[PDB]
C-alpha cells in the first residue's frame, strides 16, 4: 500500500474508563503503567501499587531490557519481550493501552508503544493525557492486586523501526535519513549537562535537528492535534515524506517523535535505540558538536 492503514495510537481517558467499567480488561484489553523515574526522585512501582487503573499491570522497563548491554534502555531479545508481556496477560490479539505518571502527561508510555510495534504488534495505544489526567478527571483508581492469567505472545522484530549505531554512522555520510533528537534544547546544544551519568558530555550528532519532546504536548499534557504536529515538523524543516530516524538520550523520548509522526500518517520513523548515551561512548568526537 502507499499508506498502511494505521491502528489508533491514542485512546481517551473517557474511552478507557468506559472499557474498564464494561469489564473489558482481559485477554482482549490489557493496561500498563510504564512509569520510570531517575534515581533519587519518584518511586514508580510504589506509586503503581498505591494507585492504578483497575486491572492495570506495572510494566517494569528496568527488567524488560537487555541488562547485559553497557548502554541504556536497550531492547530485550524477542524471547525476553514475549515471555515478559505474556506474563502480563498479553497475546498477539490483545489491545495494549499504556500510560505513565509523568507530571506533564507522557514520558515512558510512547517507548512501550514503540516496543510493541518494533516486536510486530500493531494493536497498541497510549492513554492521551496520562495518569495525570486520569487522576485530574476523577476516574477510578485502585490498590487491589492485578493478577492477569498468563498468555502467549510471539515477538517478531521489525528492523525497519530500529536503527543501530552502524546505520546512524552510515547515515552521517549517506544523508538518506533526517535525524531528529528529542532531548531538551540545552542538552542538545551542549549548554546543559547530561544527567545521571559519569563523564557523559552533552551535544548532538552532526546533521541532527532538535525537536524537544515536551513541545508535542499541550500544557494540560494531551497530544497536540495532527494539524499542529504537522506544522511543528514543517517549521523544523523535517519533511514527513522523507526518511526519519529519531534519537534522544537512551531511546525513550525519541518515541514521542515516532508517535507524533504516526499521528501525521508517517508510521515508518525508526528509533536509534542506543541514542546519545551509546553515540558518545562509541563514536569519534568529530561526529558530534557542542557549544
Ligand atoms: Na535505548
UniProtKB/Swiss-Prot annotation:
<feature type="glycosylation site" description="O-linked (GlcNAc) serine">
    <location>
        <position position="35"/>
    </location>
</feature>
<feature type="region of interest" description="Hinge">
    <location>
        <begin position="144"/>
        <end position="159"/>
    </location>
</feature>
<feature type="modified residue" description="N6-succinyllysine; alternate">
    <location>
        <position position="136"/>
    </location>
</feature>
<comment type="subunit">
    <text>Monomer.</text>
</comment>
<feature type="modified residue" description="N6-acetyllysine; alternate">
    <location>
        <position position="14"/>
    </location>
</feature>
<feature type="modified residue" description="N6-acetyllysine; alternate">
    <location>
        <position position="136"/>
    </location>
</feature>
<feature type="modified residue" description="Phosphoserine">
    <location>
        <position position="38"/>
    </location>
</feature>
<keyword id="KW-0694">RNA-binding</keyword>
<keyword id="KW-0496">Mitochondrion</keyword>
<dbReference type="InterPro" id="IPR001763">
    <property type="entry name" value="Rhodanese-like_dom"/>
</dbReference>
<feature type="modified residue" description="N6-acetyllysine">
    <location>
        <position position="163"/>
    </location>
</feature>
<feature type="modified residue" description="N6-acetyllysine; alternate">
    <location>
        <position position="237"/>
    </location>
</feature>
<dbReference type="GO" id="GO:0035928">
    <property type="term" value="P:rRNA import into mitochondrion"/>
</dbReference>
<feature type="domain" description="Rhodanese 2">
    <location>
        <begin position="173"/>
        <end position="288"/>
    </location>
</feature>
<keyword id="KW-0808">Transferase</keyword>
<dbReference type="InterPro" id="IPR036873">
    <property type="entry name" value="Rhodanese-like_dom_sf"/>
</dbReference>
<feature type="modified residue" description="N6-succinyllysine; alternate">
    <location>
        <position position="175"/>
    </location>
</feature>
<feature type="modified residue" description="N6-succinyllysine; alternate">
    <location>
        <position position="224"/>
    </location>
</feature>
<dbReference type="GO" id="GO:0008097">
    <property type="term" value="F:5S rRNA binding"/>
</dbReference>
<feature type="binding site">
    <location>
        <position position="187"/>
    </location>
    <ligand>
        <name>substrate</name>
    </ligand>
</feature>
<feature type="active site" description="Cysteine persulfide intermediate">
    <location>
        <position position="248"/>
    </location>
</feature>
<dbReference type="Pfam" id="PF00581">
    <property type="entry name" value="Rhodanese"/>
</dbReference>
<feature type="modified residue" description="N6-acetyllysine">
    <location>
        <position position="236"/>
    </location>
</feature>
<comment type="function">
    <text>Together with MRPL18, acts as a mitochondrial import factor for the cytosolic 5S rRNA. Only the nascent unfolded cytoplasmic form is able to bind to the 5S rRNA. Formation of iron-sulfur complexes and cyanide detoxification. Binds molecular oxygen and sulfur.</text>
</comment>
<keyword id="KW-0677">Repeat</keyword>
<feature type="modified residue" description="N6-acetyllysine; alternate">
    <location>
        <position position="175"/>
    </location>
</feature>
<feature type="modified residue" description="N6-succinyllysine; alternate">
    <location>
        <position position="237"/>
    </location>
</feature>
<keyword id="KW-0597">Phosphoprotein</keyword>
<feature type="domain" description="Rhodanese 1">
    <location>
        <begin position="25"/>
        <end position="143"/>
    </location>
</feature>
<feature type="modified residue" description="N6-succinyllysine; alternate">
    <location>
        <position position="14"/>
    </location>
</feature>
<feature type="binding site">
    <location>
        <position position="250"/>
    </location>
    <ligand>
        <name>substrate</name>
    </ligand>
</feature>
<dbReference type="GO" id="GO:0016784">
    <property type="term" value="F:3-mercaptopyruvate sulfurtransferase activity"/>
</dbReference>
<dbReference type="GO" id="GO:0005759">
    <property type="term" value="C:mitochondrial matrix"/>
</dbReference>
<dbReference type="InterPro" id="IPR045078">
    <property type="entry name" value="TST/MPST-like"/>
</dbReference>
<dbReference type="GO" id="GO:0005739">
    <property type="term" value="C:mitochondrion"/>
</dbReference>
<protein>
    <recommendedName>
        <fullName>Thiosulfate sulfurtransferase</fullName>
        <ecNumber>2.8.1.1</ecNumber>
    </recommendedName>
</protein>
<keyword id="KW-0325">Glycoprotein</keyword>
<keyword id="KW-0007">Acetylation</keyword>
<feature type="modified residue" description="N6-acetyllysine; alternate">
    <location>
        <position position="224"/>
    </location>
</feature>
<dbReference type="InterPro" id="IPR001307">
    <property type="entry name" value="Thiosulphate_STrfase_CS"/>
</dbReference>
<dbReference type="GO" id="GO:0051029">
    <property type="term" value="P:rRNA transport"/>
</dbReference>
<dbReference type="GO" id="GO:0004792">
    <property type="term" value="F:thiosulfate-cyanide sulfurtransferase activity"/>
</dbReference>
Amino acid at each position: 500500500m502507499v499508506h498502511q492503514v494505521l491502528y489508533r495510537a491514542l485512546v481517551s481517558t473517557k474511552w478507557l474508563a468506559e472499557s474498564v467499567r464494561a469489564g473489558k480488561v482481559g485477554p482482549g484489553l490489557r493496561v500498563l503503567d510504564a512509569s520510570w523515574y531517575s534515581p533519587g526522585t519518584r518511586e514508580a512501582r510504589k506509586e503503581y501499587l498505591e494507585r492504578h487503573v483497575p486491572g492495570a499491570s506495572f510494566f517494569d522497563i528496568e527488567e524488560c531490557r537487555d541488562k547485559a548491554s553497557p548502554y541504556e534502555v536497550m531492547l530485550p531479545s524477542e524471547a525476553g519481550f514475549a515471555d515478559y508481556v505474556g506474563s502480563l496477560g498479553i497475546s498477539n490479539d490483545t489491545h495494549v493501552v499504556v500510560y505513565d505518571g509523568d507530571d506533564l502527561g507522557s514520558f515512558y508510555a510512547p517507548r512501550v508503544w514503540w516496543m510493541f510495534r518494533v516486536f510486530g504488534h500493531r494493536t497498541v495505544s497510549v492513554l492521551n493525557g496520562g495518569f495525570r489526567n486520569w487522576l485530574k478527571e476523577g476516574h477510578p483508581v485502585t490498590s487491589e492486586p492485578s493478577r492477569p492469567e498468563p498468555a502467549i505472545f510471539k515477538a517478531t522484530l521489525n528492523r525497519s523501526l530500529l536503527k543501530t549505531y552502524e546505520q546512524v554512522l552510515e547515515n552521517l555520510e549517506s544523508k538518506r535519513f533526517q535525524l531528529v533528537d528529542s532531548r531538551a534544547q540545552g542538552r542538545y546544544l551542549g549548554t546543559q549537562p547530561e544527567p545521571d551519568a559519569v563523564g557523559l558530555d552533552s551535544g548532538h550528532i552532526r546533521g541532527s535537528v532538535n525537536m524537544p519532546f515536551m513541545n508535542f504536548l499541550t500544557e494540560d499534557g494531551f497530544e497536540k492535534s495532527p494539524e499542529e504536529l504537522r506544522a511543528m515538523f514543517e517549521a523544523k524543516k523535517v519533511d514527513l515524506t522523507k526518511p526519519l530516524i529519531a534519537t534522544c538520550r537512551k531511546g525513550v523520548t525519541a518515541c514521542h517523535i515516532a508517535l507524533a509522526a504516526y499521528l501525521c500518517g508517517k508510521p515508518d520513523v525508526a528509533i536509534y535505540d542506543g541514542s546519545w548515551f551509546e553515540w558518545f561512548h562509541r563514536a569519534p568526537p568529530e561526529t558530534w558538536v557542542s557549544q
